[PDB]
């Protein structure tokens, strides 16, 4: 009974983990979008200077 309760507690913590990881991807994607934009301008600027 205690092993089953521990397996159920792990499943509960896992559902919280999956919810926590989804919120981190949405934030990671936002950051990754800006960094790519910034990185693209810095490349285009660098490319124009070399051209």
């Amino acid at each position: 009974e205690l092993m089953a309760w521990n397996q159920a507690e792990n499943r509960r913590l896992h559902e919280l983990r999956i919810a926590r990881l989804r919120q981190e991807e949405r934030e990671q994607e936002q950051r990754q979008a800006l960094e790519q934009a910034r990185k693209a301008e810095e490349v285009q600027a660098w490319a124009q200077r070399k051209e």
């Binding site: 205690l2 092993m3 309760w5 521990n6 507690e9 792990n10 913590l13 896992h14 919280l16 983990r17």
Partner: peptide
């Protein structure tokens, strides 16, 4: 031969001690 996995992420040290006391 049984293995007991206890996930402790997000739990305080006092809750970890109380958890393993209950199950083992």
């Amino acid at each position: 031969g049984e293995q007991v996995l206890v996930d402790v992420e997000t739990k305080s040290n006092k809750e970890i001690m109380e958890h393993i006391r209950k199950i083992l």
